[PDB]
Design a protein around this ligand. Structure first.
Ligand SMILES: Cc1nonc1C(=O)N[C@H](c1nc(Cc2n[nH]c(=O)c3ccccc23)n[nH]1)C1CCCCC1
Lengths: 112, 107
């Protein structure tokens, strides 16, 4: 079906199975989260990661410029109000959200 | 307002190799549930307990850990309903990062 009903009273499911950890701070590719708010969307607030460094942190605690911190982006669906400002009708939309960062070897190639 | 039930049009409007190149590499596992939308959820599992060093060997002094994201999914309610759902909140691993471990003597 094109149109369906959704009950917005969320039930949690296994959110206390493999659940504070401070990975964003302990990572060799650390990041910070920034708040994105849009009143025309559910969820209205989405937190986005931004990597703190271009490089990665090494064993000595210094930045290793030979490796790159990169954000891990995830395709996410959101509900957008349709028509605009509607309290109770939406369309699904697809966006990319950065969830955190990892450290990768760069892709290397001579200029052509 | 904050209505209990809302209408959603499911015709979506749109708005990498890191898993192998990462020092905390991972593989993706596919979870399919016909009672859910999205029916398919892809989940990362870290390949190693440690992280990969400059030489390409595993360094056990660091840990590969999953980066978990809280996400909402639609679960059919009542079961098997083609057109009615409830939002549910789940935790999904979206990739891995390399962290310094938390160390403490046994008590
Ligand atoms: C967070 C967040 N910040 O804004 N919104 C959200 C959010 O939860 N949005 C949900 C969501 N998006 C998808 C995308 C996805 N698909 N497949 C995967 O393998 C996957 C694997 C990992 C993660 C996502 C997916 N799943 N759940 C929507 C919410 C409205 C109803 C429909 C679900």
């Amino acid at each position: 079906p094109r149109t369906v009903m959704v009950n917005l009273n969320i039930h949690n499911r296994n959110t206390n199975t493999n659940p504070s950890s401070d990975y964003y701070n302990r990572s060799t590719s650390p990041w910070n989260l920034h708040r994105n708010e849009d009143p025309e969307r559910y969820p209205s607030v989405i937190w986005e990661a931004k990597c703190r460094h271009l490089g990665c942190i090494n064993a000595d605690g210094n930045v290793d410029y030979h490796m790159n911190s990169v954000p891990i982006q995830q395709e996410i669906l959101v509900l957008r109000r349709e028509p605009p400002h509607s309290p109770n009708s939406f369309r699904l939309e697809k966006i990319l959200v950065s969830v955190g960062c990892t450290c990768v070897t760069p892709i290397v190639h001579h200029v052509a």
